[PDB]
Design a protein around this ligand. Structure first.
Ligand SMILES: Nc1nc2c(ncn2[C@@H]2O[C@H](COP(=O)(O)OP(=O)(O)OP(=O)(O)O)[C@@H](O)[C@H]2O)c(=O)[nH]1
Ligand SMILES: [Mg+2]
Lengths: 427, 351
């Protein structure tokens, strides 16, 4: 049964965690006694409507504020697939976390509230339906399902006109991003009631498409590049009684087996795999797509962090002394010059990088040079630029390992530009 | 010709404080503006006369030499520059090198001052360069912190920390413990500056609640706590990105207004470029031209220009706000290579 990684994305409060939680529940992955206890705890803290969300949101600050802060990973299994599902935050402060999530994903569920004002807000200039869609594209997610959520809400009440309104807006925007919009399901659901999650909803007779589970089965599994050299960007590092220090991350390329000797770049520390675990099931090998924790003998937690990359010793992950990229500028309030230093979000990493030169401005559609060494770039421009990371950074050429070779540029907490790396000068 | 800027002074001050001599043979000399240099000259001469009274030969020679090299650098000037002159001259004992530095300070000197000592006497120049407006910045998250420092438009990371708060060898930290760690580390870096009177404020920044808990707790030394900015600033990132975010957003701290002005000017400069408004004058001629007309609303000067002080002077009279672009600023080198580090923004068009 093929495995897939699913990221759940969308604007703050639109219903991401409630969807995932409620889906896991009616699919029977969550103990009724636990759902009962969560509900009681939720009511007693003034937050009844967070009972499904609190399956995913566990941190003290998440519960206090009623928001997701960082990623949560859950295994569930449909008729055709086994999914690792990744719950991502909508809050603008934590889009860096959502991005690491997208970098690990094969497909995305975009959760979009149909509630009056909630939709418009998410799709507004500085909204996260807009931003998350953009970032998901740049991190290389092609398969997308959209859950038009909260159909149950009184200000919505299962209205097909409201639904078709959000669908059309979403379609015009998504097509401008390069999505193949004709192929993607727009399912009207209620993450809270359950409508169209797993079974079909009587409240919405006018809807003929897949339910969300059906839509999942209609996805297609991605290429498994087992013959390219091992690369595992670390998403987090735990220190675990019995195991020791265990990096977690999704195997992008190559294969990893217990016994293997592995190196973590850019620090250059080397350890040896004691064990491998996916969703609490011990493994002996892990292949691309596997989202795993791997115990490492001889490595201290302080040696390694998120955004580090693990490969085998003979073909270690490339550390960029500098690198070259083709970029498009989504948004900027003035202009970008040589010297401009946004943070680069690539795979699980995020490191400020200085533009040391702008070799050429390109026509954004054709790719031809329109000017050698432009005096600056502005919103709407495309370019070939050189980048020097402020601290050691791992990147690969897009042509070689695309999952370590696509990136976003962010500055003053906004997404400014997008990029693919066309060349790397190794450290 | 001689006048240096405050940045150029601070750099020099760092070299001068290394100079030492086994006896009182380093010459320090401060001449207020408008002193007939022929009168300073008469004084150095009377000083020279007294040198033969110095019994120790190697001392007497080191002093004669320094007075001569001073009387030489002086002989070349007709009169003093607008802010007066300072001269430091003698041979450094550990290195062996002999030099006679001469320059005019950013600000005017108010007393005549002559001294031979084992070191150069730089106090007046130290007081001239410390503006006593430093702001400490601490960005706190549950498992990350960044400590940085703001003086003027110069922003810098002093220390980054990552803790062991969870989301053979086993390591593990509670939030409370990482906060204590962060606090101590911030204190060691910042409390010294607070005592020299340099540090006027501490900003606490970061995403969400962790920054509030960090303040409420007993992590930060009381002396830092006394100069806390009232408003916590929400920012998403760590490191320099985080620091910039925090400084831009801390609108109620006056010591940060300078950095904001530098960043906002460069942004208005770039806007004009991107919108093709043509309200930007550059080149010394056109800048001088526009300046003479009172046309320039804001002048941007790269701190590394030698004639920096000339233009700073011209601007204040011309009606132009000044912005000194420091080499730390992101656009600094581009502004230097592409516009020679000198450009104004017009408040009205010339053509
Ligand atoms: N009426 C109605 N309310 C919903 C529905 N789904 C979620 N909500 C409510 O919307 C609020 C936000 O729910 P969350 O699941 O935390 O939204 P989220 O996108 O996952 O949250 P963030 O990660 O913080 O952006 C909660 O109070 C939910 O009860 C729905 O289908 N119908
Ligand atoms: Mg959530």
């Amino acid at each position: 049964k093929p495995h897939m990684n699913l990221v759940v994305i969308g604007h703050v409060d639109h219903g991401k965690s409630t969807l995932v939680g409620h889906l896991l529940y009616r699919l029977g992955y969550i103990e009724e006694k636990k759902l009962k206890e969560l509900e009681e705890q939720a009511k007693s803290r003034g937050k009844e409507s967070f009972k499904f969300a609190w399956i995913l949101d566990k941190m003290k600050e998440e519960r206090e504020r009623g928001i997701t802060i960082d990623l949560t990973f859950m295994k569930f299994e449909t008729k055709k697939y086994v999914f690792t599902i990744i719950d991502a935050p909508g809050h603008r402060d934590f889009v860096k976390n959502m991005i690491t999530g997208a970098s690990q994903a094969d497909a995305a569920i975009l959760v979009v509230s149909a509630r009056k004002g909630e939709f418009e807000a998410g799709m507004s200039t500085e909204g996260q339906t807009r931003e998350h869609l953009l970032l998901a594209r740049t991190m290389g997610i092609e398969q997308i399902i959209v859950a038009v959520n909260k159909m149950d809400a009184p200000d919505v009440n299962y209205d097909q006109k409201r639904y078709e309104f959000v669908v059309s807006v979403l379609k015009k925007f998504m097509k401008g991003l390069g999505y193949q919009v004709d192929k993607i399901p727009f399912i009207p659901v209620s993450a809270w009631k359950g409508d169209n999650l797993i079974e079909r909803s009587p409240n919405m007779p006018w809807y003929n498409g897949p339910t969300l589970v059906e839509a999942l089965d209609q996805l297609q599994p991605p290429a498994k590049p087992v013959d390219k050299p091992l690369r595992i960007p670390v998403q987090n590092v735990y220190s675990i009684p019995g195991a020791g220090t265990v990096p977690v991350g999704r195997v992008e390329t190559g294969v990893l087996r217990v016994g293997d000797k592995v190196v973590f770049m850019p620090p250059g520390v080397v350890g040896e795999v004691r064990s491998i675990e996916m969703h609490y099931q011990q493994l002996q090998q892990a292949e691309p797509g596997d989202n795993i924790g791997f115990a490492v003998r001889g490595v201290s937690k302080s040696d390694i962090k998120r955004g580090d990359v693990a490969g085998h010793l003979d073909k270690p992950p490339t550390v960029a002394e500098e690198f070259e990229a083709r970029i498009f500028v989504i948004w900027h309030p003035s202009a970008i010059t040589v010297g401009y230093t946004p943070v680069i979000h690539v795979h699980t990493a995020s490191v400020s990088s200085r533009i040391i030169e702008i070799k050429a401005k390109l026509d954004p559609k054709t790719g031809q040079v329109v000017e050698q060494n432009p005096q600056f770039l502005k919103a709407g421009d495309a370019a070939i630029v050189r980048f020097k990371p402020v601290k050691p950074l791992v990147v690969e050429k897009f042509s070689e390992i695309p999952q370590l070779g696509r990136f976003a540029m962010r500055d003053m907490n906004r997404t400014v530009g997008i990029g693919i790396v066309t060349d790397v000068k190794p450290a | 010709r001689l006048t240096i800027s405050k940045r150029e002074l601070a750099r020099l001050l760092k070299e001068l404080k290394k100079w030492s001599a086994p006896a009182t043979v380093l010459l320090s000399l401060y001449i207020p503006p408008g002193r007939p240099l022929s009168d300073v000259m008469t004084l150095l001469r009377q000083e020279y006369s007294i040198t033969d009274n110095i019994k120790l030969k190697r001392t007497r020679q080191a002093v004669k030499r320094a007075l001569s090299a001073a009387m030489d650098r002086l002989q070349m000037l007709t009169s003093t520059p607008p802010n007066g002159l300072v001269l430091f001259c003698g041979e450094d004992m550990s290195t062996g090198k002999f030099e006679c530095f001469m320059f005019s300070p950013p600000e005017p000197i108010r007393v005549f001052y002559y001294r031979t000592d084992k070191r150069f006497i730089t106090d007046f120049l130290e007081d001239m360069v410390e503006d006593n407006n430093a702001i400490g910045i601490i960005i706190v998250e549950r498992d990350q912190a960044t400590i940085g420092l703001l003086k003027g438009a110069r922003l810098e990371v002093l220390k980054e920390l990552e803790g062991f708060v969870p989301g053979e060898r086993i390591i593990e930290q509670m939030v409370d413990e990482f906060f204590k760690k962060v606090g101590e580390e911030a204190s060691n870096l910042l409390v010294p500056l607070a005592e020299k009177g340099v540090l006027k404020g501490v900003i606490v920044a970061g995403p969400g609640l962790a920054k509030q808990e960090f303040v409420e707790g007993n992590y930060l030394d009381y002396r830092l706590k006394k100069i806390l900015a009232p408003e916590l600033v929400d920012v998403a990132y760590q490191g320099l990105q985080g620091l910039k975010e925090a400084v831009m957003k801390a609108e109620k701290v006056v010591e940060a207004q300078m950095y904001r002005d530098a960043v906002n000017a460069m942004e208005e400069f770039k806007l004009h470029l991107a919108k093709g408004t043509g309200m930007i004058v550059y080149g010394e001629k056109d800048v001088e031209a526009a300046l003479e007309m009172g046309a320039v609303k804001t002048l941007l000067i790269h701190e590394s220009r030698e004639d920096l002080e000339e233009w700073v002077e011209k601007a204040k009279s011309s009606g132009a706000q000044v912005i000194v672009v420091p080499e730390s600023l992101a656009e600094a080198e581009w502004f230097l290579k592409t516009f020679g580090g000198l450009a104004g923004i017009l408040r009205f068009r010339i053509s």
